[PDB]
Amino acid sequence: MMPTPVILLKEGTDSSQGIPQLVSNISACQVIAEAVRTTLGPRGMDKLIVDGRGKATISNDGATILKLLDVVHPAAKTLVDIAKSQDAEVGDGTTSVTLLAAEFLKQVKPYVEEGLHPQIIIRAFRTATQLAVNKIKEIAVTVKKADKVEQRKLLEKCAMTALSSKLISQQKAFFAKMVVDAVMMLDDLLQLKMIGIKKVQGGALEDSQLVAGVAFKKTFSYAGFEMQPKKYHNPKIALLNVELELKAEKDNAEIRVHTVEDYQAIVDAEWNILYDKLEKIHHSGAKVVSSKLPIGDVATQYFADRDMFCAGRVPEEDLKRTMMACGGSIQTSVNALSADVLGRCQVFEETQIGGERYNFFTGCPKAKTCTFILRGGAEQFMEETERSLHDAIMIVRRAIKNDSVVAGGGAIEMELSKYLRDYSRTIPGKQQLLIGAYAKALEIIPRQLCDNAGFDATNILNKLRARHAQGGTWYGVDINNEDIADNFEAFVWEPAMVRINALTAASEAACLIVSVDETIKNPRST
Amino acid sequence: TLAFDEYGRPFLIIKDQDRKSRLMGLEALKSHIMAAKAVANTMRTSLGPNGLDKMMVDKDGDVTVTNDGATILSMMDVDHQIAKLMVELSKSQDDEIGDGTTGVVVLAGALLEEAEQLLDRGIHPIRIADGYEQAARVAIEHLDKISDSVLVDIKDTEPLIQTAKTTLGSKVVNSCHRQMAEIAVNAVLTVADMERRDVDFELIKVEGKVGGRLEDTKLIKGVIVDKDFSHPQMPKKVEDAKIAILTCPFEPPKPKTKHKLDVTSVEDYKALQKYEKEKFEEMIQQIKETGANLAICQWGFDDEANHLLLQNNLPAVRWVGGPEIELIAIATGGRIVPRFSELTAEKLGFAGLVQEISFGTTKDKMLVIEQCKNSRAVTIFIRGGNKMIIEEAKRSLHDALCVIRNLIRDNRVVYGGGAAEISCALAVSQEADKCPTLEQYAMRAFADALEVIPMALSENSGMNPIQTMTEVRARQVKEMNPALGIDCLHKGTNDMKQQHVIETLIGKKQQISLATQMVRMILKIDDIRKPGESE
Amino acid sequence: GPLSVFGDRSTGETIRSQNVMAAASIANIVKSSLGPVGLDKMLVDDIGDVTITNDGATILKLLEVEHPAAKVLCELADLQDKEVGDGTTSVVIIAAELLKNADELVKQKIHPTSVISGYRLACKEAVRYINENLIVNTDELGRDCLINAAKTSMSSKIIGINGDFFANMVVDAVLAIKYTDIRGQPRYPVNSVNILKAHGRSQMESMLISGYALNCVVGSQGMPKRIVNAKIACLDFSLQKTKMKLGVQVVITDPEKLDQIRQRESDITKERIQKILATGANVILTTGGIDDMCLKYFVEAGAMAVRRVLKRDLKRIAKASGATILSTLANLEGEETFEAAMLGQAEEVVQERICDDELILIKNTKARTSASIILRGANDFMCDEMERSLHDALCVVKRVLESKSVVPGGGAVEAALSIYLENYATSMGSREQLAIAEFARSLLVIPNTLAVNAAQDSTDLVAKLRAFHNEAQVNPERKNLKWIGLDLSNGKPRDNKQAGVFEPTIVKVKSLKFATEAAITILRIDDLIKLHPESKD
Ligand SMILES: Nc1ncnc2c1ncn2[C@@H]1O[C@H](COP(=O)(O)OP(=O)(O)O)[C@@H](O)[C@H]1O
Ligand SMILES: Nc1ncnc2c1ncn2[C@@H]1O[C@H](COP(=O)(O)OP(=O)(O)O)[C@@H](O)[C@H]1O
Numbered sequence A: 001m002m003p004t005p006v007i008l009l010k011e012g013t014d015s016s017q018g019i020p021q022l023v024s025n026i027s028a029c030q031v032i033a034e035a036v037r038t039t040l041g042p043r044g045m046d047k048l049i050v051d052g053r054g055k056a057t058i059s060n061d062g063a064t065i066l067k068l069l070d071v072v073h074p075a076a077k078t079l080v081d082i083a084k085s086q087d088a089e090v091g092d093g094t095t096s097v098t099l100l101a102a103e104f105l106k107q108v109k110p111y112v113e114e115g116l117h118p119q120i121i122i123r124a125f126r127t128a129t130q131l132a133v134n135k136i137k138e139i140a141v142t143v144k145k146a147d148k149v150e151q152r153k154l155l156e157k158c159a160m161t162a163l164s165s166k167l168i169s170q171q172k173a174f175f176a177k178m179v180v181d182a183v184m185m186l187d188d189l190l191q192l193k194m195i196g197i198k199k200v201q202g203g204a205l206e207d208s209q210l211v212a213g214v215a216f217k218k219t220f221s222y223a224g225f226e227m228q229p230k231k232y233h234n235p236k237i238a239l240l241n242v243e244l245e246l247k248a249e250k251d252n253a254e255i256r257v258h259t260v261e262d263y264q265a266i267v268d269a270e271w272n273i274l275y276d277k278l279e280k281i282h283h284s285g286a287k288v289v290s291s292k293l294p295i296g297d298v299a300t301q302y303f304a305d306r307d308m309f310c311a312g313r314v315p316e317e318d319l320k321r322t323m324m325a326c327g328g329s330i331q332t333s334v335n336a337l338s339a340d341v342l343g344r345c346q347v348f349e350e351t352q353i354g355g356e357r358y359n360f361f362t363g364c365p366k367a368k369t370c371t372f373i374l375r376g377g378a379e380q381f382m383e384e385t386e387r388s389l390h391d392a393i394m395i396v397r398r399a400i401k402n403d404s405v406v407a408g409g410g411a412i413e414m415e416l417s418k419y420l421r422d423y424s425r426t427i428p429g430k431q432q433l434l435i436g437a438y439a440k441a442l443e444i445i446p447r448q449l450c451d452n453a454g455f456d457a458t459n460i461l462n463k464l465r466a467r468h469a470q471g472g473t474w475y476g477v478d479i480n481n482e483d484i485a486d487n488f489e490a491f492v493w494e495p496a497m498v499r500i501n502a503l504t505a506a507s508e509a510a511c512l513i514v515s516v517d518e519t520i521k522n523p524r525s526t
Numbered sequence B: 001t002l003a004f005d006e007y008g009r010p011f012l013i014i015k016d017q018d019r020k021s022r023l024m025g026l027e028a029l030k031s032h033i034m035a036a037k038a039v040a041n042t043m044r045t046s047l048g049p050n051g052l053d054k055m056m057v058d059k060d061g062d063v064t065v066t067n068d069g070a071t072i073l074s075m076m077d078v079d080h081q082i083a084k085l086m087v088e089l090s091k092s093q094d095d096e097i098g099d100g101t102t103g104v105v106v107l108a109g110a111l112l113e114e115a116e117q118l119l120d121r122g123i124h125p126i127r128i129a130d131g132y133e134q135a136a137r138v139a140i141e142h143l144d145k146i147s148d149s150v151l152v153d154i155k156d157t158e159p160l161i162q163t164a165k166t167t168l169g170s171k172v173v174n175s176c177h178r179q180m181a182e183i184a185v186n187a188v189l190t191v192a193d194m195e196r197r198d199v200d201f202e203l204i205k206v207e208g209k210v211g212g213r214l215e216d217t218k219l220i221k222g223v224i225v226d227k228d229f230s231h232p233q234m235p236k237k238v239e240d241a242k243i244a245i246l247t248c249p250f251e252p253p254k255p256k257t258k259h260k261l262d263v264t265s266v267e268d269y270k271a272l273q274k275y276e277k278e279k280f281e282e283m284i285q286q287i288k289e290t291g292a293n294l295a296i297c298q299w300g301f302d303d304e305a306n307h308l309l310l311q312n313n314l315p316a317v318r319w320v321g322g323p324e325i326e327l328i329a330i331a332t333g334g335r336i337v338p339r340f341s342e343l344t345a346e347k348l349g350f351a352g353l354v355q356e357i358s359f360g361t362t363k364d365k366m367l368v369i370e371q372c373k374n375s376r377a378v379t380i381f382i383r384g385g386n387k388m389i390i391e392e393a394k395r396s397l398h399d400a401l402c403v404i405r406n407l408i409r410d411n412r413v414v415y416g417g418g419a420a421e422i423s424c425a426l427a428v429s430q431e432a433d434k435c436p437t438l439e440q441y442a443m444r445a446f447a448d449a450l451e452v453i454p455m456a457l458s459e460n461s462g463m464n465p466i467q468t469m470t471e472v473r474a475r476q477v478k479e480m481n482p483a484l485g486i487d488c489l490h491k492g493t494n495d496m497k498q499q500h501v502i503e504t505l506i507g508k509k510q511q512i513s514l515a516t517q518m519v520r521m522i523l524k525i526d527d528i529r530k531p532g533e534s535e
Numbered sequence C: 001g002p003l004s005v006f007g008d009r010s011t012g013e014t015i016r017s018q019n020v021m022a023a024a025s026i027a028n029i030v031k032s033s034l035g036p037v038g039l040d041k042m043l044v045d046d047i048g049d050v051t052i053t054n055d056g057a058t059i060l061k062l063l064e065v066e067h068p069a070a071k072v073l074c075e076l077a078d079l080q081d082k083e084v085g086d087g088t089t090s091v092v093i094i095a096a097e098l099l100k101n102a103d104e105l106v107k108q109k110i111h112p113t114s115v116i117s118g119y120r121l122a123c124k125e126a127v128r129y130i131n132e133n134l135i136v137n138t139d140e141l142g143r144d145c146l147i148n149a150a151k152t153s154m155s156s157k158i159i160g161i162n163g164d165f166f167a168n169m170v171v172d173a174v175l176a177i178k179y180t181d182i183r184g185q186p187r188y189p190v191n192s193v194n195i196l197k198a199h200g201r202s203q204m205e206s207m208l209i210s211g212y213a214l215n216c217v218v219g220s221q222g223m224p225k226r227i228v229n230a231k232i233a234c235l236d237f238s239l240q241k242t243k244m245k246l247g248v249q250v251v252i253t254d255p256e257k258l259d260q261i262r263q264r265e266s267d268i269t270k271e272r273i274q275k276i277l278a279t280g281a282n283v284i285l286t287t288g289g290i291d292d293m294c295l296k297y298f299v300e301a302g303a304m305a306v307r308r309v310l311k312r313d314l315k316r317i318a319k320a321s322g323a324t325i326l327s328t329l330a331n332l333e334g335e336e337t338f339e340a341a342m343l344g345q346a347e348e349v350v351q352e353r354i355c356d357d358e359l360i361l362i363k364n365t366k367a368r369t370s371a372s373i374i375l376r377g378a379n380d381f382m383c384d385e386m387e388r389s390l391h392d393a394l395c396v397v398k399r400v401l402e403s404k405s406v407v408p409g410g411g412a413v414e415a416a417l418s419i420y421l422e423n424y425a426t427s428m429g430s431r432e433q434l435a436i437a438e439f440a441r442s443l444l445v446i447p448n449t450l451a452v453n454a455a456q457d458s459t460d461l462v463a464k465l466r467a468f469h470n471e472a473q474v475n476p477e478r479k480n481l482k483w484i485g486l487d488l489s490n491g492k493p494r495d496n497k498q499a500g501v502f503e504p505t506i507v508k509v510k511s512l513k514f515a516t517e518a519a520i521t522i523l524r525i526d527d528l529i530k531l532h533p534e535s536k537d
């Protein structure tokens, strides 16, 4: 009843102001944190989100669940972007970054309702975060005896905990051994495009395998592929970027002929153009032909008579992996074919895995790439297995360049609460209610390890705060037994930069929510 | 409150949150079991040789009577994401093995029904899922105890016929239970590469035509295509065919680019007539110089080239498909020639009785190839009384072609009829006491769910489930456990070794492995984020 | 499969989070109207009526609610008026913060029955500590206790002036209606004070009428409107013409007997009016009706007659003036006796000018010397606010004179209970110590709300507040820091003993008993079923 002007404010916009705006932003982050709350820990469940088209996506990753909720709240989009940056920087910090940033707002939620101008909270959050990321670097263990069997065992323990809380229960010793062997075959770039993860429907998780070479899906061929048998003991691969069809036209050629004696010479020349390209592939040992451009019926029957195999319409992502596997080079022009541009393998067969055919390469010792073939019972089952595989790969990718690891579980998150509560009792002012509130907010990572399976989480935090204040600093939460356990001796490991980027992204997100005091939304939504 | 804050502001998190549906509760796991048990109770009546079929109607009004579990769940309009995973479970069994697509859905619904009473006792759903992995591992190792086969693909086809009779015994082909079982055995061994243990189903052409009966289904060694003789006075029977397979149409050679050929004088137009007149005499003479008496062409014929076939006594067919002529060159041993100039006597195919057979009053006239010479491609011609019995026989015999393929991949067998499920249920119960620390109740729920498949065979056969299963299971403990199951007419004794009920090892190995992993993905879920209305 | 109810069912932590937001939706409204720095609100209806008030009972009664957990806190404010009368913004904030801190406990997988049993050990200990740490009864301070307790209630309202004008009128009103009872019970019925409203001069012209102020008119404009040495005749029967009942009818058989019956309806009527007027009665109060024929007998004899007065107003006049409420004729088969010795007495009955209305005043009533307060404000919105603020001020001095015990206000009780219950939770606390520790933090919201509405320092003034109360419990050197409160006009902890910030004991004892009991019922809504409205069938 108050605002009735002749000319309105902007158009029709509503804007909240002050203290009711800030509690509206904190309580909004609590609702979106419930979609990643039940996905923490090995006893954490997954979630299924269906869109309007009917496509079902079952996952437990924070970067997968939060992107499918279609959240339109302005403050709640901050917790989605830190789950996207954790997948882009680390790859396995996802559900922990979103839930810890919501606790930084809920611990100051009784403090923002009673005074406490938020510049003191931003200064206290940046002070506690810099001390938290420094105590991790001063306690992260490392070794000086690398390039041995001990360094490979360090990469396997970080991949088993990365494969934890996924859809893998007893296949931790089988899958994580293949993840470490996948990145050690790569070069010194650690590119994720140099490893193919292809899903084949049909088969259990034990039927999966890590191919040392490459394997493509055997796309649409022509008449002549029931010939050309798949038994090669030492073949050569001709990677091409040319068309092997009779109708290869430059789309601007007009062959004006004058007589019938020269008219037949043009048609004989069009076959002689295609057959000259096939003679360049021949007489060089290249029994296997690969090209991203299609091959017609003429060149398919020519290779079947000369006992040669071909494969057309190969995707460009597969030919780049095939080039690094066999050690050759993709030649667009067939005139420059030699022994230096062809590939070399040992076993090249076309199997029948999952009903569909797959042409797999194996036996090449100079393989700078690999291919991990997944076999599952559903399309959404293999998509979760592919999403769980990317989290284990990106952990062991960062662990090579930085081998400093910390203890898994809630071992680091509890001892950082010890060093911050001892720091808060040595400084005067209003920071005792904010540094200590930052330390109590870090204790939810051992809470969600217990609240997902009961475990009497109130009594298990009194044992964690007593063990870290008395003895070791790597005591966490045991999952099989309902007690505290040393996670460093139980081989529950994780890299140190997983928790460094988790504390950095959660603090910068929590400092952004407390810094906005007005929210203006324009009604034009077309 | 929802859609409003305590300060009066509107509380909107996601878009269209008023028309959303979210369940975490304790009934989110209960809604997954009741949706999966109704699929398992539907497929329970179609299990075993006394399993009754189901009538499926498509969206266009087409009716297909199906019995295999792969096509039943695939042709549904179920908009339920838990039951959609049961469709992909039966599809994954069909793509890998292809025999237990019905039994893998009843087994998955049995593991979830036993987990419902375990959920009310306070057990965590992942703790049941971790207990099923330790229980299914015992069922895999116990299934590899008794397994042997003596198949040599020369004269010992008797284990191969009795293996295919177990797959075909549950379908509607029990009238041809001995005839059609021998068709699927000889169709695999003639096309399989025993050096690589690889079978290609592209070489086995499955065609069907209405008319005749089910007993008229023959294994035609060769190819069966729709014959399209352009001349009606063509001879309809070739005794010794030198088949000239070509991929060039009987026409003057047209290039692939734009030509726009210029004609200036009348001497150039008279040169056009002599160019085509000598071209049709060149394409006909180059076939007759090779000694050929039959031609196959992918593309069409000209009218001028049709009469030149009759003058030279050269029958030829017209407009054959893509992969159809690929099967002719393997069955006859010839080569597919692109042009007419590359024809020779070495690229010709060899065949015996080449003829067309008219079926009643129709005008199809399919090709019948009787004689051959070391062909690696066969064609099964399925006949019947209607299209409902033919399309089912195409699905029934495809399951018989898959169980022979699984014997070449792995030559180990088991004994079906519920004999392997009762023996595997005793192995989990013996290892449940070694040790009953935490997962004692999860392993006993696995053994009680493995007994649902043999007790479903006792229900469909008119017997009693708990009366017949208690007798068979007790006889395997009092002595050494034989191949002891059940049957419909029961064949006298209950010995599966004497009744010749033989199933593959890797068929039942993937039934326990795929149903356990699909249960783990529907037990490890505590939220549903489905929308409301469509629009 | 599931439940086939036609309503709606929501289980788990959904309703456990909705009841806290339902209680916080009510507490965030009334948080801006607490303490001397509190501000009033506006209650606009759909018909156009505007109600400006700041009391916790008047706001929540007119405000419509829908949630079942919201109706508990709204009915909690209605009970505070009958039991205490000023304690009706502080109970709603405590009972909602009791659910906010208990929601943080049940999210830690702590069972709510331990929180219910933990709250009962902290509520009974809070009453035990407040009854052993009072300063003094009403003997040492005397009249200074009644004035300082009255000014604490008025500080949150429109009558919170720096002077003692409204404070002295309330104490002189309760002290003039001292009604003794059996077994030594000096009762003070505050409902007998007729609080009247009139849009007139400023608030400094509010008259304290020693007697009673009747809100009625004389009627006929021929009666003397001022009678000195008046004799009040309180009676309840309509002075109209004699109408026969349903069982009696007039069936006449003779036309000569017609006019004698018609004159008899007024002769019996005027026979009562001549025997109640010959006994010296000058003022006649009637709850029934005096018609135009009977008004002539008061103009002719020179008496005042007031018609259609309230029944609740006649009992306050007849008890204060010694009059007897007579309904009919009586006294052992007497025709017309009226018991003339039982007439009331009054010094002066005068109808004054009350800004374009008529108001009848009775001066000192000669028997009991009652009191009535006539309020003066700018508009009708201030007069409705001045009536609610005066009625809450009358309930404060009523409980002090009845229960001679006062506690220091301004957050001094909530500061001492915030530290004593933390030490109480450490002694006998094994599993319910977390509920007693959150009972102390929920009580701290009363000094926290005083710092927010004053725009002062929040986390430093209350931290300095409990610094003095901690030294008063762990350092037994007679520090006397149990009366440390808040100075909201300066922003520093002050001593409420010398400053005169006094509150009654049962304004916090009954507040902590009603808020703890209301927090138990809302803590047991783990399952909630809402059926569909059955309106059109
Ligand atoms: N064996 C184990 N014992 C106890 N805790 C474990 C174990 N394995 C994993 N966890 C815990 O499970 C959590 C999984 O976190 P995760 O969801 O992977 O984080 P992000 O989403 O950032 O990848 C880790 O914080 C870790 O402490
Ligand atoms: N003669 C027989 N005696 C007893 N049981 C039989 C006999 N023939 C078939 N069965 C049983 O009938 C079942 C049929 O399963 P089926 O529906 O074919 O599985 P899928 O759907 O995977 O093909 C088999 O599990 C087998 O044990």
Ligand SMILES: Nc1ncnc2c1ncn2[C@@H]1O[C@H](COP(=O)(O)OP(=O)(O)O)[C@@H](O)[C@H]1O
Residues within 6 Å of the ligand: C033, C034, C035, C036, C055, C056, C080, C085, C086, C087, C088, C089, C090, C091, C151, C152, C153, C155, C156, C392, C409, C410, C411, C450, C485, C486, C487, C488, C501
């Ligand atoms: N002079 C003062 N100094 C400090 N605090 C005061 C002063 N006067 C009143 N208060 C505080 O203001 C509060 C007003 O409470 P109030 O809303 O009247 O409760 P209710 O709604 O039950 O009547 C009291 O709790 C009291 O502590």
Ligand SMILES: [Mg+2]
Residues within 6 Å of the ligand: B099, B166, B167, B168, B170, B171, B399
């Ligand atoms: Mg079968």
